[PDB]
Design a protein around this ligand. Structure first.
Ligand SMILES: CCCCCCCCCCCCCCCCCC(=O)OC[C@H](COP(=O)(O)OCCN)OC(=O)CCCCCCCCCCCCCCCCC
Ligand SMILES: CCCCCCCCCCCCCCCCCC(=O)OC[C@H](COP(=O)(O)OCCN)OC(=O)CCCCCCCCCCCCCCCCC
Ligand SMILES: CCCCCCCCCCCCCCCCCC(=O)OC[C@H](COP(=O)(O)OCCN)OC(=O)CCCCCCCCCCCCCCCCC
Ligand SMILES: CCCCCCCCCCCCCCCCCC(=O)OC[C@H](COP(=O)(O)OCCN)OC(=O)CCCCCCCCCCCCCCCCC
Ligand SMILES: CCCCCCCCCCCCCCCCCC(=O)OC[C@H](COP(=O)(O)OCCN)OC(=O)CCCCCCCCCCCCCCCCC
Ligand SMILES: CCCCCCCCCCCCCCCCCCCC
Ligand SMILES: CCCCCCCCCCCCCCCCCCCC
Ligand code: SF4
Lengths: 60, 323, 110, 149, 198, 162
């Protein structure tokens, strides 16, 4: 490789190292399951149930 | 049995044993710290549940690898297969055996020094070759051949990168190398020596981006793939102990060793060593992995001429100011 | 001197305890944990001349490296004459390296 | 939105950067979707809209009948052949449906782009190294579910 | 209640040997190295659990070995295709003791929606499964919940401390079903959020 | 100092004996590496510190790495010559063993009549060796560079793949 290519490559390596270190200075984006409960939107498709009418009888 | 010479003999032996135990535990807890610092670099936490802050994660890994079933392949050659992790551990451990961590705290004040380090590096490439061949896996054999050719391509200039520091000190002794850095640390005059030694030290430790079992995973050609239990653990802990040894050698050869203005000398040595260990982690986190031919061509075409030119220029400078 | 013999004893104990430590971890790994059998557990999971060429280049340049190792520890008392001799040595080295690179000996890629 | 195009040569790198520009264009489309979302129905007013709107199903008998037959026996598609081609994430994806007048497809043919890209692999990687092959596989943007269906 | 693999037996558990068994179980359950094996979309959710937003490394289970010899856990995350079933069996046979299996997703559980000519109807037709995860795909925290369930199962199993001394049988605890454990809290649910909001 | 000398010499002799009679090439190279390590220990016991360092760095760290590399490349397994164990048959080795024993007896008899004040083991450093190498032995250094260049050119010409 050329000298200019080597110097530019070293500069890009330095930039990558610097950006990942600044990432180490950043805020964690981890959702701490299970101590922090998973937020689920109201129409989330998980466990199936059978429900009751307002009178208390089963709707099925 | 009451004599100052005998008391000094057991004092020196106890200091050597303390250095050995601290280095081995530092390598294992640096496997743990590798996990935690990669978590820090990637906006996460890493292992922080097994003990306080994950501090017992290493103990859990050690128990798991001890009580994992011991396995040797039936078609493998048992002696060489067993022997390869032993060399991968002991080579860079005995390379640490020359590092002066404090004034008066050294295991072996040898007249050869970094020559002993070069001896240990050659035995380390033996560990990689033996692990590849003894597994009776042709993929592991091919991967170990590539890893060994890479390691030779960088060990060809490792010592030459150290020769500028040796020339400035006028000695192979490590304490004389430290004492020659009393005014200016060697990273300023031997800057190209420092960068070539750092690249070669990463390469001979098979660290990223020179890690063959992680470089090519689609071929399944890693030379670790038949190792399990405590032999794979020996490979892991030996790799981390090698990182610790390379960091300590870089500190003592290019960053004044234990020398510092205010703090105690061991505190300065430990701080500089921990900084270079952390820089190993950041190198693993940040840089991508070049191609195999590109890596070996970089070692042969760029770094080795740079070490030769650096040695010649260092000699010219030394003889120029020798009035 | 008792300092050098104390350091020799410390070095010997260092090597012995390091070798015995890795031996002890291997023995403990072999001894502990149950063993199980499987049918395919025993089942495992021509290289070019460039490998030999690279290893051979490493050997030759390592010998020239030993010559420069011997030079570098005694540069001051070899003077400028030793500098001229080592410069001739290094020039022959770099000419050999240029020759190897230019003829494709160090080109893994086609 | 714009369609990013290359200079004439398709490497791993040019494919990856083209997908980066495609991501930026998709962000522009999403901004337009956020700013101008029309008011109206989320289901068509067609008798074959499956299922019908749920509130009318729950209180109107003809809608309940339509829902009952659509979810159980199935909607009756009159006998025809239809085709739809879209720009999927990994290339052009198409459905070719043949209906024989029943509540099930007589033939569902799914053209996926990853099948074609994996077939192109030997012509593009010939004369290269294995490292070039794994980088090429990383730059193709395929999944094996797309290839094998 | 325990099941023995060499039958339904009782607990075989000196007080020092119990402490050693607890220490070995603690070390095994806190160091679980999964095998990097991807079958289908469920594997995408598994490696999503490996990333920063979930950080499965916190449980000490991120190492993700490419060799079955270094792996303690096989996650069948995806469909057991008929062509891939010998591959799965060979990779499981190449794993070393102790080894655990998590079947992840409806395909690995039972064949899922793919009751089709080219799909084996569940990975438990030919290899034993320690933990099942329903879902298509299970979300990454469901994989983490199954990891914790596997940790609870490991923490009370009985395995030989050495292969030269003592009983060599593997005892697995007959744990209470999660359905029956959670039935009390699940049936008591009355109202949920209406699906018209965010 | 003599304890190390005699034990390292015995280890080197025994390892060489295992080398010249072994069947597996990788095992033979491992015993050769062990003998070179023992010879380096002999060098360190005599005060030749640079020689021992180069014995492990170059002989047991480069040349035998090349031998091991070639063996691993050749995939030497169940070779027909390897399986025969012709060198283990008495009628093959009894002649050369007698010849080597006679040569050893003559050389040892010549050795035992030389003047011997003993080796003090005073360490001759790498610095003095470097001074001698670039002083009186300058032509040796430059023509050794030429010799290794010749080895490089020959081995590239012969060991090419083409
Ligand atoms: C404690 C340990 C760490 C200490 C920190 C300092 C040392 C870091 C050591 C890292 C070692 C990594 C070595 C990587 C060498 C890669 C060389 C290579 O092959 O690069 C290939 C690339 C392109 O090559 P080319 O042939 O032109 O390709 C054209 C074909 N399309 O060519 C290029 O991209 C050209 C440039 C290549 C890289 C130049 C060297 C970079 C070294 C890493 C950055 C270090 C920065 C300082 C860090 C902080 C120090 C305190
Ligand atoms: C003692 C402890 C501390 C040790 C410190 C070690 C590091 C060296 C000293 C600091 C160097 C600072 C470098 C600053 C780089 C800035 C980042 C950057 O912008 O880099 C990229 C830039 C090229 O930009 P562009 O072309 O747009 O790239 C994107 C397309 N690829 O790239 C450039 O413009 C390149 C600019 C020049 C970079 C090199 C500067 C001189 C280096 C001299 C020493 C040689 C280093 C390499 C030797 C390798 C030999 C094997
Ligand atoms: C003061 C000494 C400076 C260094 C001189 C020696 C450097 C050796 C590095 C090397 O291996 O260089 C190989 C290089 C090959 O160059 P080439 O393949 O022709 O490139 C064409 C497009 N760049 O070849 C070169 O870069 C040529 C370098 C000069 C060759 C003549 C002098 C040799 C001594
Ligand atoms: C599985 C086991 C395989 C075999 C492993 C090794 C077996 C032997 C282990 C026991 C060793 C006992 C101790 C040896 C002596 C230590 C002290 C010593 O070497 O002192 C001599 C000399 C002193 O030099 P200095 O301090 O400068 O004094 C100047 C004037 N007095 O200092 C010197 O001369 C220093 C240079 C010599 C240091 C040699 C260190 C060991 C080298 C072999 C490493 C083997 C690595 C593992 C196996 C590799 C593959 C086979
Ligand atoms: C224990 C019984 C046998 C068991 C089986 C074999 C085990 C290995 C035995 C060989 C290695 C250890 C030999 C004993 C060394 C003990 C240290 C010693 O002798 O120190 C004296 C001297 C110190 O240097 P100096 O300053 O001259 O001091 C003279 C006194 N003031 O020292 C010196 O000058 C030189 C010091 C020795 C040289 C460095 C170490 C060489 C190691 C070579 C190992 C070769 C491979 C062995 C493989 C074994 C299995 C097959
Ligand atoms: C990564 C660092 C590895 C170091 C290995 C050796 C550790 C030796 C510890 C020696 C401690 C005492 C040093 C001399 C006294 C000066 C410092 C006093 C406060 C610690
Ligand atoms: C296929 C051909 C094989 C040829 C093998 C040659 C082996 C030669 C062995 C020579 C043995 C000499 C024994 C001692 C002779 C008497 C003492 C020396 C001469 C005075
Ligand atoms: S269970 Fe669903 S998400 Fe998982 S592999 Fe099967 S189809 Fe994919």
């Amino acid at each position: 490789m050329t000298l200019k290519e080597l110097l530019v490559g070293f500069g890009t390596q330095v930039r990558s190292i610097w950006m990942i270190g600044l990432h180490a200075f950043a805020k964690r984006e981890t959702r701490m399951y299970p101590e922090e409960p998973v937020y689920l939107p109201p129409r989330y498709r998980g466990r199936i149930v059978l429900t009751r009418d307002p009178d208390g009888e089963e709707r099925c | 049995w009451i004599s100052p010479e005998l008391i000094e003999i057991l004092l020196t032996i106890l200091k050597a044993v303390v250095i050995l135990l601290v280095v081995v535990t530092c390598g294992a807890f640096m496997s743990f710290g590798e996990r935690r610092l990669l978590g820090l670099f990637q906006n996460r936490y890493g292992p922080n549940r097994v003990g306080w802050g994950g501090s017992l994660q290493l103990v859990a890994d050690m128990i798991k690898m001890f009580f994992k079933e011991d396995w040797i392949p039936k078609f493998s050659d048992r002696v060489i297969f067993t022997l390869a992790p032993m060399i991968a551990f002991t080579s860079l451990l005995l390379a640490f055996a020359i590092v002066p961590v404090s004034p008066g705290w050294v295991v072996a004040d040898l007249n050869i020094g970094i020559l002993f380090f070069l001896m240990m590096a050659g035995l380390a490439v033996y560990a990689v070759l033996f692990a590849g061949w003894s597994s009776n896996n042709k993929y592991s054999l091919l991967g170990a051949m590539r890893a060994s050719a890479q390691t030779l391509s960088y060990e060809v200039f490792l010592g030459l990168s150290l020769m500028g520091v040796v020339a400035q000190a006028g000695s192979f002794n490590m304490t004389d190398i430290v004492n020659s850095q009393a005014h200016v640390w060697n990273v300023i005059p031997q800057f190209f020596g420092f960068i070539t030694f750092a690249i070669a030290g990463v390469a001979v430790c098979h660290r990223h981006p020179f890690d063959q079992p992680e470089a090519e995973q689609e071929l399944a050609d890693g030379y670790h793939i038949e190792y399990s239990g405590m032999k794979f653990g020996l490979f892991f802990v030996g790799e981390y102990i090698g990182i610790v040894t390379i960091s300590a050698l870089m500190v003592t050869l290019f960053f004044g060793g234990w020398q510092g203005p205010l703090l105690p000398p061991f505190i300065w040595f430990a701080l500089k060593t921990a900084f270079f260990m952390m820089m190993f982690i950041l190198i693993r986190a940040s840089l991508p992995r070049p191609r195999y031919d590109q890596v070996m061509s970089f070692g042969w075409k760029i770094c080795l001429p740079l070490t030769l030119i650096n040695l010649l220029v260092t000699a010219a400078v030394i003889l120029w100011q020798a009035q | 001197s008792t300092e050098v013999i104390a350091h020799h004893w410390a070095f010997a104990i260092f090597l012995i305890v390091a070798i015995g430590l890795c031996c002890l971890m291997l023995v403990g790994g072999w001894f502990l944990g149950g063993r199980a059998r499987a049918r395919s557990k025993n089942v495992p999971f021509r290289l070019s001349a460039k490998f030999y060429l690279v290893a051979m280049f490493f050997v030759i340049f390592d010998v020239e490296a030993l010559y420069l190792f011997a030079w570098s520890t005694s540069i001051r008392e070899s003077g400028w004459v030793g500098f001229v001799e080592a410069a001739i040595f290094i020039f022959v080295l770099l000419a050999g390296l240029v020759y190897l690179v230019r003829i494709g000996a160090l080109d893994w890629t086609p | 939105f714009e369609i990013p195009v290359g200079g004439g040569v398709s490497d791993c790198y040019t494919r990856v950067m083209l997908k980066v520009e495609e991501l930026r264009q998709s962000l522009r489309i999403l901004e337009q979707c956020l700013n101008n979302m029309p008011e109206g129905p989320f289901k068509a007013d067609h008798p074959l809209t499956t299922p019908p709107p749920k509130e009318r199903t729950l209180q109107h008998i003809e809608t309940l009948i339509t829902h009952f037959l659509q979810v159980s026996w199935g909607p009756v598609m009159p006998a025809n052949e239809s085709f739809q081609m879209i720009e999927a994430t990994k290339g052009i994806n198409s459905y070719y449906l043949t209906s024989d007048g029943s509540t099930m497809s007589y033939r569902t043919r799914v053209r996926t782009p990853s099948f074609a890209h994996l077939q192109q692999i030997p012509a593009a990687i010939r004369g290269s190294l294995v490292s070039d092959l794994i980088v090429y596989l990383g730059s193709i943007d395929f999944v094996m579910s797309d290839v094998d269906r | 209640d325990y099941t023995l693999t060499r039958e339904i037996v009782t607990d075989p558990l000196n007080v020092f040997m119990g402490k050693l068994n607890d220490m070995v179980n603690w070390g095994r359950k806190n160091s679980i190295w999964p095998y990097n094996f991807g079958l289908s979309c469920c594997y995408v959710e598994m490696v999503t659990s490996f990333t920063a937003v979930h950080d499965v490394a916190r449980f000490g289970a991120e190492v993700l070995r490419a060799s079955p010899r270094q792996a303690d856990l096989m996650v069948v995350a995806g469909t057991c295709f008929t062509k891939m079933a010998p591959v799965i069996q060979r990779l499981y046979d190449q794993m070393l003791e102790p080894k655990w299996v998590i079947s992840m997703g409806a395909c690995a559980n039972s064949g899922g929606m793919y009751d089709i000519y080219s799909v084996v109807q569940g990975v438990d037709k030919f290899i034993p499964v320690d933990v099942y995860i329903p879902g298509c795909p299970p979300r990454p925290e469901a994989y983490m919940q199954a990891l914790m369930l596997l940790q609870e199962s490991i923490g009370k199993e009985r395995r030989p401390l050495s292969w030269v001394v003592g009983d060599q049988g593997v005892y697995r605890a007959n744990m209470q079903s999660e359905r029956e454990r959670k039935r009390g809290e699940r049936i008591a649910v009355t109202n949920l959020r209406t699906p018209d909001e965010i | 100092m003599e304890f190390a000398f005699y034990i390292c010499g015995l280890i080197a002799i025994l390892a060489t004996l295992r080398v010249i009679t072994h069947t597996n090439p990788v095992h033979a190279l491992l015993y050769l590496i062990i003998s070179l390590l023992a010879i380096s220990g002999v060098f360190f016991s005599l005060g030749a510190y640079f020689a021992g360092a180069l014995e492990i760095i170059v002989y047991a760290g480069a040349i035998m790495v090349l031998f091991v590399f070639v063996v691993m490349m050749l995939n030497l397994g169940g070779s027909e010559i390897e399986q025969e164990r012709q060198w283990l048959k008495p009628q093959v080795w009894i002649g050369p063993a007698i010849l080597s024993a006679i040569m050893l007896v003559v050389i040892v008899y010549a050795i035992l009549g030389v003047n011997d004040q003993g080796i003090d083991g005073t360490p001759i450093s790498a610095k003095a060796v470097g001074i001698t190498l670039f002083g009186p032995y300058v032509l040796a250094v430059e023509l050794a560079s030429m010799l290794l260049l010749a080895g490089l050119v020959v081995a590239f010409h012969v060991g090419r793949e083409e």
